[PDB]
Amino acid sequence: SMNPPPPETSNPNKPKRQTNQLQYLLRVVLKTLWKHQFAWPFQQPVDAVKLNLPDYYKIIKTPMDMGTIKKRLENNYYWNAQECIQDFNTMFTNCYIYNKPGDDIVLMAEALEKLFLQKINELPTEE
Ligand SMILES: COc1cc(OC)c2c(=O)[nH]c(-c3cc(C)c(OCCN4CCCC4)c(C)c3)nc2c1
């Protein structure tokens, strides 16, 4: 069994910026979710080999996780807040697509997503 390579976190070809919205995504959004009791399954790529989920990357063709998002924010990968918000939504959607209502992982994702929605509702206007 084999995991795919992780998503890209560095790419000198990619355009990027620092902005106040991206700062908020790191300081407020990511750090709020990261510290939550239910964060840990989402803090790194799904290890389908050790978890014995051999169909994971058959179903999930755009993997995403908060470890990747953390690296992207720390490494100034993004051009805008949309790109980062999309990564969070990909992560949640993957979980919902792969699993079933009521699964522990789905309940965990929902708790994180609740907080995500609350924080992104107060994303500041661009400076
Ligand atoms: C450690 O980090 C992660 C991260 C993840 O996503 C971010 C996932 C993920 O999406 N799914 C699962 C996962 C989900 C279920 C339902 C599952 O089944 C339990 C037993 N079954 C229930 C009923 C009959 C028997 C098993 C073995 C694994 N594990 C993950 C682990």
Domains of the chain by residue range: 19-123
The CA-based dihedral angle spanning residues 62, 83, 110, 58, taken in that order and rounded to the nearest 10 degrees: 0
Three-class SS of residue 4?
A: coil
CA-derived radius of gyration, the chain: 15
Count the Cβ atoms, other than its own, within 10 Å of residue 54.
11
DSSP one-letter string for 19-85: -HHHHHIIIIIIHHHHTSTT-GGGSS---TTTTT-TTHHHH-SS---HHHHHHHHHTT--SSHHHHH
Ligand 1 atom at minimum distance from 109 CA: 7
Residue whose CA is closest, atom 4 of ligand 1?
41
Q: Which residue has the tokens 């560095």?
A: 10
SS3 121: helix
> Chain centroid to CA 43: how far?
8
Tell me which of 3.30.1490.20, 1.20.920.10, 1.10.10.10, 3.60.21.10 is the CATH number of domain 19-123.
Answer: 1.20.920.10
- List, chain by chain if needed, residues with CB within 6 Å of any ligand 1 atom: 41-42, 46, 51, 53, 95, 98-99, 103, 105
C-alpha 44 to ligand 1 mean position (Å): 14
Helices 66-74, 81-98: inter-axial angle, 10-degree rounding:
170
